[PDB]
Amino acid sequence: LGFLGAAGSTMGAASMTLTVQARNLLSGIVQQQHLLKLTVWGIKQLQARVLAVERYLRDQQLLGIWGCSGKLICCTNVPWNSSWSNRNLSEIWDNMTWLQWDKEISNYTQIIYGLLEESQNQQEKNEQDLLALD
Amino acid sequence: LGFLGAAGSTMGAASMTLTVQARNLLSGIVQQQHLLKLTVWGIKQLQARVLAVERYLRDQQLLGIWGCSGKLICCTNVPWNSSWSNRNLSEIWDNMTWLQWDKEISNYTQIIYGLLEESQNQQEKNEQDLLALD
Amino acid sequence: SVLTQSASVSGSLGQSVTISCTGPNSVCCSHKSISWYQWPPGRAPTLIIYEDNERAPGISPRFSGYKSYWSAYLTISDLRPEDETTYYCCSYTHNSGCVFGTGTKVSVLGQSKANPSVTLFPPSSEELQANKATLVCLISDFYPGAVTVAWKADSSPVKAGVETTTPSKQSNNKYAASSYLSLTPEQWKSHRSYSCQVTHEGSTVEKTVAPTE
Amino acid sequence: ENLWVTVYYGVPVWKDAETTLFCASDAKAYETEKHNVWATHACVPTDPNPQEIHLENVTEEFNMWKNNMVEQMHTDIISLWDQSLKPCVKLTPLCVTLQCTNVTNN
Amino acid sequence: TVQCTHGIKPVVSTQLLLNGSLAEEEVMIRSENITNNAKNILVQFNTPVQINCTRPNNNTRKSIRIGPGQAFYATGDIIGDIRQAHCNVSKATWNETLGKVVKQLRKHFGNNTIIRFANSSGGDLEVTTHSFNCGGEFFYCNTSGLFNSTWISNSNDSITLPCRIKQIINMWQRIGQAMYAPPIQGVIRCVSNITGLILTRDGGSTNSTTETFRPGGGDMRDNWRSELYKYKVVKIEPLGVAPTRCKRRVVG
Amino acid sequence: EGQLVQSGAELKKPGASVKISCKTSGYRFNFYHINWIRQTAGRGPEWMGWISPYSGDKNLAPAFQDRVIMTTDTEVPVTSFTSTGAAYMEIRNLKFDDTGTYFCAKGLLRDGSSTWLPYLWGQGTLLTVSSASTKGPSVFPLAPSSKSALGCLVKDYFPEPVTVSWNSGALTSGVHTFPAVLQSSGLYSLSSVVTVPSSSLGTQTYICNVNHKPSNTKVDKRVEPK
Ligand SMILES: *[C@@H]1O[C@H](CO[C@@H]2O[C@@H](C)[C@@H](O)[C@@H](O)[C@@H]2O)[C@@H](O[C@@H]2O[C@H](CO)[C@@H](O[C@@H]3O[C@H](CO[C@H]4O[C@H](CO)[C@@H](O)[C@H](O)[C@@H]4O[C@@H]4O[C@H](CO)[C@@H](O[C@@H]5O[C@H](CO)[C@H](O)[C@H](O)[C@H]5O)[C@H](O)[C@H]4NC(C)=O)[C@@H](O)[C@H](O[C@H]4O[C@H](CO)[C@@H](O)[C@H](O)[C@@H]4O)[C@@H]3O)[C@H](O)[C@H]2NC(C)=O)[C@H](O)[C@H]1NC(C)=O
Ligand SMILES: *[C@@H]1O[C@H](CO[C@@H]2O[C@@H](C)[C@@H](O)[C@@H](O)[C@@H]2O)[C@@H](O[C@@H]2O[C@H](CO)[C@@H](O[C@@H]3O[C@H](CO[C@H]4O[C@H](CO[C@H]5O[C@H](CO)[C@@H](O)[C@H](O)[C@@H]5O)[C@@H](O)[C@H](O)[C@@H]4O)[C@@H](O)[C@H](O[C@H]4O[C@H](CO)[C@@H](O)[C@H](O)[C@@H]4O[C@@H]4O[C@H](CO)[C@@H](O)[C@H](O)[C@H]4NC(C)=O)[C@@H]3O)[C@H](O)[C@H]2NC(C)=O)[C@H](O)[C@H]1NC(C)=O
Ligand SMILES: *[C@@H]1O[C@H](CO)[C@@H](O[C@@H]2O[C@H](CO)[C@@H](O[C@@H]3O[C@H](CO[C@H]4O[C@H](CO[C@H]5O[C@H](CO)[C@@H](O)[C@H](O)[C@@H]5O)[C@@H](O)[C@H](O)[C@@H]4O)[C@@H](O)[C@H](O[C@H]4O[C@H](CO)[C@@H](O)[C@H](O[C@H]5O[C@H](CO)[C@@H](O)[C@H](O)[C@@H]5O)[C@@H]4O)[C@@H]3O)[C@H](O)[C@H]2NC(C)=O)[C@H](O)[C@H]1NC(C)=O
Ligand SMILES: *[C@@H]1O[C@H](CO)[C@@H](O[C@@H]2O[C@H](CO)[C@@H](O[C@@H]3O[C@H](CO[C@H]4O[C@H](CO[C@H]5O[C@H](CO)[C@@H](O)[C@H](O)[C@@H]5O)[C@@H](O)[C@H](O[C@H]5O[C@H](CO)[C@@H](O)[C@H](O)[C@@H]5O)[C@@H]4O)[C@@H](O)[C@H](O[C@H]4O[C@H](CO)[C@@H](O)[C@H](O)[C@@H]4O)[C@@H]3O)[C@H](O)[C@H]2NC(C)=O)[C@H](O)[C@H]1NC(C)=O
Ligand SMILES: *[C@@H]1O[C@H](CO)[C@@H](O[C@@H]2O[C@H](CO)[C@@H](O[C@@H]3O[C@H](CO[C@H]4O[C@H](CO[C@H]5O[C@H](CO)[C@@H](O)[C@H](O)[C@@H]5O)[C@@H](O)[C@H](O)[C@@H]4O)[C@@H](O)[C@H](O[C@H]4O[C@H](CO)[C@@H](O)[C@H](O)[C@@H]4O)[C@@H]3O)[C@H](O)[C@H]2NC(C)=O)[C@H](O)[C@H]1NC(C)=O
Ligand SMILES: *[C@@H]1O[C@H](CO[C@@H]2O[C@@H](C)[C@@H](O)[C@@H](O)[C@@H]2O)[C@@H](O[C@@H]2O[C@H](CO)[C@@H](O[C@@H]3O[C@H](CO[C@H]4O[C@H](CO)[C@@H](O)[C@H](O)[C@@H]4O)[C@@H](O)[C@H](O)[C@@H]3O)[C@H](O)[C@H]2NC(C)=O)[C@H](O)[C@H]1NC(C)=O
Ligand SMILES: *[C@@H]1O[C@H](CO)[C@@H](O[C@@H]2O[C@H](CO)[C@@H](O[C@@H]3O[C@H](CO)[C@@H](O)[C@H](O)[C@@H]3O)[C@H](O)[C@H]2NC(C)=O)[C@H](O)[C@H]1NC(C)=O
Ligand SMILES: *[C@@H]1O[C@H](CO)[C@@H](O[C@@H]2O[C@H](CO)[C@@H](O)[C@H](O)[C@H]2NC(C)=O)[C@H](O)[C@H]1NC(C)=O
Ligand SMILES: *[C@@H]1O[C@H](CO)[C@@H](O)[C@H](O)[C@H]1NC(C)=O
Ligand SMILES: *[C@@H]1O[C@H](CO)[C@@H](O)[C@H](O)[C@H]1NC(C)=O
Ligand SMILES: *[C@@H]1O[C@H](CO)[C@@H](O)[C@H](O)[C@H]1NC(C)=O
């Protein structure tokens, strides 16, 4: 459980400790640490540190437009379409690893993302027009 | 008070203006600004700009998993252990600079961080399982 | 003094003692913060309560208190045989100094009546050179803090020889005192043998030694 | 008891350490003279407004003979000297048997 | 707490620093270790001494094509007489600076011993003479004339120094690659403020008295220390935890 | 956590004017305030005036603002958080009513609700404003009676405290002591205990010295054999 401890465990047990996975990835790699410094290792270190933040910030930009700036688990007001999966409540959470589930939505994973921005943020932050001051 | 104005002042007075300190650090340094551009200054500029964001994002990743995505001051639901400090309410806030306090918890500062992720986020975002829809 | 004190208050072991103080509206207890100090007479002082009820860092939480529209006080719970010393208090606003009280000499009874190890010290060969007549004695751990001055020259108490001295509280939180003498050398040589008189509540076994030999 | 812990982002604390710095010089010679060996051909221009703040009640212990700012300065100027000399005329066929005589002093 | 330092210029000098910074008071004395005489000593001038160096030689650029494009710029025949290079120093202004230094060294160094100012004993001609690049060419003015004065226990004449010019150099003892300095055609003058001094040991005197510090600038890093004695960088940590009765909502 | 220590043991005539000092150590001297108090022959000690080592804005007592005034110089920093400084005070007029013991103390805290009140106290200074002249104490041995508890004797000394009474500082653990006494003549005296196990006289030493200021000390008398 020190890192990816529940990679093979159930999606429910993996959902119990998903903080750990998030903590190590951005921070990890110990990047922090003749006269030249133009060596082949330093240039592989810098670009490896650039995608470090540019893959982190690629994901953190998505949660910000979903109301999840500082939450590891948002429940979003987007209804689930039956075409994406036909399995019941306890059918997936007590049976599949997150690995199996990632390939089962990888086909229509982009369709979900586009709809998440519309109802949870594009409309929700607008619904306060009549409720902010009245 | 333009920057670090209360570095030597009380932790309470420093807590009155801690916005300022936060604003300047990420932005600061005016980084924004023969035909080659491979000079010794440009390479010291780029890596100095990389740790700029990779030390900022090293800290901003911690506040996100503490419910403090966009707050400079969160009050966290983690109880304080007496072993960390024995001083009363007005004993530290009216007497110590933040400098003195940073060395007084630097021993057990990591113990606090690990516990902050568990009760304020690892359990709190889970406590909505029975309260989100019911 | 414009501040008040509970004067002499007593107490017992393992129990509580309260000392109150109230003042006039100029430097009173209403809307003016207060504080309480420990003060061994002659020795170095200490601090106990800050502003109101918040006690000192280090001071055991045994010390309670509060503040009404005039009554200000200090509830010292679970008394231990170190608290026997005079206490004080002083009122102050934000930007002003402290206006001290008068003195509550607190004594903690319920103690064990201790018997002192007392012995008399007579003059030596150097006192006869100056001819100054003096003879003293040592008492320690003679609780209670009561004294009885008496001597015996010619089997009768001296009228001009008794020198009453101030008793002190020993650093072991007990008591200590000594009695001196101011007489002429002729009266020393005129009256040889001597006796020590210490009125101590108990059995009559007091040490007694002569000055000529 | 019954005290909680609270987080503060923007606190003024620091620890002694050293990292990379950079040059800063405004418009000096540019057209009337250029190709400077120190400011190179282009460095990060400094702002005319000086960034300064007076710190009070603070007494941080400095060090000069253990300071690493002079170390990065020492090594920066060295790598800068060689960088401004690599693209210039080499003088290797100047090592040939020289036949000289003293100058005309009458 | 400043973000940008002050106008720091990389003066490549030896024994005597030029154009340095200083902010009043007695002529400051700095040493990594005062008791050890072996360690170097940096000295700062409460006021600078205006010095002028120049070469009287009137040279000419002789370009000769070596290979395809490259051209070797050498000295032609010197027109209009031949003279030796020199650096003037204000004689009256220097006697006051050597007096202010010995005064503040006094309470620093016993204030009972004898001052013995001598030329840079030992060393190399480039590390013992006031070596510096000025006007293109590299001067090496003879120091030995300045420190001849000895002061102890209680229109105008100016001292000058003989100097020679060198075209082949590889400074700070870098033996990797050397460089040729093209002679700057025409006139040359330097005219810089001197603001610092670099002084080194005075032998292994066993107790007794009598000692000072003769000039040596064996290291180039110390030259930059005369400007960075007050600067230090720190790693800002914007994170800080502190307790206070204070909790957010119970369940969320 | 910062120890404060006073000068101590200065005394002069009634119409004189003396200054007392206080050595600080172990705390930042810049913001912690300094104040003074005095206990008289009367029962109640009273407060004087509080000084701030920064800015110098002070509010002394109204009854002493006319005569007593006090200043304080800057400090020398030991580290970033520890430093050592000094505080002085001058008093112009005084009488027998102004005699007694004087203390200084560190300011409580460096904030708002309350700062002016003391915190850590020094060992204190006692001042005698008695017009009688200073005198040199006299030394006597004080021998035990039943030798066939130890100490030495002091008789007739004019003012203040004679303090430490032991030779070479050989024994500091287990050395009970004793206070002073007022004589009918007005010339003080005192004695001192020392609790050490009973042993032989030839094996160990029986020498004690006392220090003085009324007149300097020199002789450390010892005890008679019998
Ligand atoms: C670090 O450096 C700083 C210096 O930085 C400064 O920054 C700015 C501000 C400029 O001044 C710069 O030039 C400086 O560089 C040093 O900072 C100083 O520390 C001192 C020691 O801590 C402090 O000295 C004295 O503080 C006393 C206490 O303050 C009052 O008020 C405050 C704020 O309200 C409060 O927090 C206090 O506990 C205390 O109590 C309050 O008093 C007010 C006023 O009476 C009450 O208000 C009443 O309220 C009711 C309604 O409720 C009603 O309206 C009444 O009418 C109203 O009066 C209030 O109820 C009280 N309770 C509270 C809220 O707690 C001051 O009393 C004392 O004042 C003296 O100096 C003042 C400033 O010149 C004068 O105006 C005044 O007349 C006195 O002469 C001192 O200020 C300094 O103030 C403080 N800063 C300054 C200004 O220098 C610092 O020492 C140094 N070290 C540290 C600690 O790091
Ligand atoms: C530092 O060192 C440099 C380098 O000098 C080097 O060594 C010298 C010896 C010479 O060989 C250089 O070529 C060599 O690099 C010095 O620079 C040289 O200084 C010398 C000093 O003598 C100069 O020599 C004089 O040159 C005069 C002109 O000759 C030039 O052109 C020649 C061909 O041109 C022909 O036609 C022109 C007219 O259009 C005639 O004027 C010329 O004579 C030719 O007929 C060419 O070959 C030369 O190299 C040069 O470029 C020349 O007139 C002088 O010779 C005269 O007069 C001298 C006194 O001034 C006297 O000492 C000589 O003996 C000589 O007398 C006779 O003249 C006859 C004329 O026909 C001749 O036929 C006889 O042979 C001759 N007698 C004999 C025998 O010698 C000089 O020779 C030289 O020009 C400088 N460099 C150049 C530009 O080449 C530099 O000065 C030194 N430093 C300093 C500041 O001293
Ligand atoms: C410590 O600090 C001190 C501070 O004093 C430093 O010392 C010296 O400080 C001086 C301050 O003035 C600096 O002086 C400058 O000198 C340059 C020299 O450049 C000349 O030569 C260049 C190349 O030669 C060409 O031209 C010459 C003819 O001159 C010819 O013979 C050659 O064959 C070749 O063709 C030229 O490019 C350059 O133009 C000039 O001729 C000089 O350029 C500076 O000019 C200022 O002052 C002059 C004289 O008063 C004035 O005419 C200038 O006016 C304007 O017009 C001219 C002509 O068109 C133009 O070049 C300028 O750009 C202006 O538009 C201008 O006001 C100046 O004189 C000196 O360099 C500096 N260093 C030295 C040598 O010590 C000291 O260096 C510091 N520490 C140490 C020891 O390093
Ligand atoms: C940077 O410049 C400095 C400038 O000082 C230069 O230092 C030079 O260092 C060299 C080598 O170290 C010195 O070289 C030799 O010094 C010889 C010493 O003098 C002998 O003869 C004396 C008579 O000379 C007269 O002038 C001298 C000064 O040189 C003066 O002290 C004398 O009083 C006298 O007037 C003789 O007196 C002296 O010793 C006796 O007297 C002294 C003083 O009273 C006494 O203390 C002794 O007990 C004893 O009784 C000694 O015996 C010098 O002789 C020699 O050459 C001289 O003569 C030749 C031939 O004529 C001349 O051409 C030459 O100019 C000299 O006059 C030679 O000079 C040199 O003296 C230092 N300084 C200079 C230039 O004079 C540095 O080396 C330079 N740095 C670099 C990079 O090179
Ligand atoms: C700036 O840096 C300098 C660096 O020198 C600091 O300067 C200090 O100066 C003092 C001056 O007294 C030195 O004191 C002595 O140094 C001796 C050096 O040891 C040498 O010899 C050792 C043994 O070699 C043989 O000779 C010695 C001679 O004493 C014989 O005793 C021995 O039997 C041998 O026959 C070698 O092992 C060593 O490598 C050296 O070659 C010390 O030996 C000497 O020790 C004495 O004092 C000690 C401390 O009280 C004590 O414990 C020993 O028993 C002995 O009595 C003594 O230290 C300092 O050494 C020197 N510092 C350093 C780093 O060496 C200077 O302090 C600093 N800046 C400041 C703070 O001003
Ligand atoms: C922060 O914590 C460090 C180290 O503590 C560790 O980390 C914390 C989080 C806990 O997990 C601890 O259990 C860890 O051990 C403290 O460091 C201490 O520093 C001091 C001073 O440098 C050390 O003291 C040493 O003392 C040596 C001499 O020992 C003497 O006493 C022993 C025991 O009786 C005796 O056997 C011996 O003969 C000596 O008489 C001395 O040689 C050495 O140079 C040094 O002075 C101490 O050992 C360190 N801690 C420990 C326990 O190792 C910090 O002080 C602490 N800071 C704060 C603010 O809390
Ligand atoms: C350094 O040397 C150069 C070159 O010799 C000097 O330049 C020369 O200066 C003179 C000053 O009058 C110029 O004037 C005259 O030129 C005519 C025609 O050539 C000549 O007949 C005169 O005798 C006189 O020289 C001269 O043109 C000029 N250049 C040359 C080619 O000599 C310069 O003056 C010397 N030093 C400096 C900087 O003053
Ligand atoms: C050189 O030393 C003398 C005396 O050795 C200095 O004069 C003062 O002497 C007294 C007593 O020795 C010291 O307490 C002073 O500190 C000395 N003065 C000072 C201010 O240091 C003399 O001052 C010393 N040299 C100089 C001019 O500073
Ligand atoms: C003050 O500290 C003590 C422990 O030293 C603690 O028991 C007490 O609860 C603290 N005070 C408060 C306000 O709780
Ligand atoms: C030229 O100078 C050198 C310098 O060593 C000297 O040896 C040689 O004899 C000199 N020749 C003439 C003739 O001047
Ligand atoms: C340097 O030159 C200037 C030119 O005005 C002159 O005033 C000054 O005295 C000279 N200084 C020396 C001693 O070289």
Numbering used by the authors:
A (entry chain B), B (entry chain B): 520 to 552, 564 to 664
C (entry chain E): 2 to 214
D (entry chain G): 32 to 137
E (entry chain G): 244 to 306, 309 to 321, 321A, 322 to 398, 410 to 507
F (entry chain D): 1 to 52, 52A, 53 to 72, 72A, 72B, 72C, 72D, 72E, ...
Paper lines:
Subsequently, XFEL diffraction data collected by manually targeting individual crystals (~75 µm × 75 µm × 50 µm dimensions) improved intensities of high-angle Bragg reflections as previously observed for XFEL datasets, resulting in a 3.8 Å resolution structure of the BG18-BG505-35O22 complex from 520 still diffraction images. The XFEL dataset averaged diffraction data from approximately 400 crystals. Moreover, the improvement in resolution from 4.1 Å using conventional crystals to 3.8 Å resolution by exposing smaller crystal volumes using an XFEL offers the potential to examine natively glycosylated Env trimer–Fab structures to higher resolutions. N-glycans near the BG18 and 35O22 interfaces were modeled as mostly oligomannose (Man5-9GlcNAc2) in our structures to avoid over-interpretation of the electron density, except for complex-type glycans at positions N88gp120 and N156gp120, which were assigned as complex-type based on density for a core fucose in our 3.8 Å XFEL structure. In the BG18-BG505-35O22 structures, 17 N-linked glycans were modeled into ordered electron density, forming glycan arrays that extended ~22 Å from the Env surface. Indeed, the observed differences in the orientation of the BG18 Fab light chain on Env influenced the N332gp120 glycan conformation, as the glycan D1 arm reached in close proximity to CDRL2 and the gp120 GDIR motif in the BG18-BG505 complex, which differs from the interactions of the N332gp120 glycan D1 arm with light chain framework region 3 (FWRL3) in the 10-1074-BG505 complex. In addition to the BG18 interaction with the N332gp120 glycan, BG18 makes secondary interactions with the N392gp120, N386gp120, and N156gp120 glycans. The N392gp120 glycan threads between the BG18 cleft that is located between CDRH3 and CDRL1/L347, burying ~425 Å2 of Fab surface area against the glycan. Despite variability in V1 across HIV-1 Envs, we observed engagement of V1-loop protein components with BG18 CDRL2 and FWRL3 residues, accommodating the V1-loop into the nearby positively charged cleft formed by CDRH3, CDRL1/L2, and FWRL3 loops.
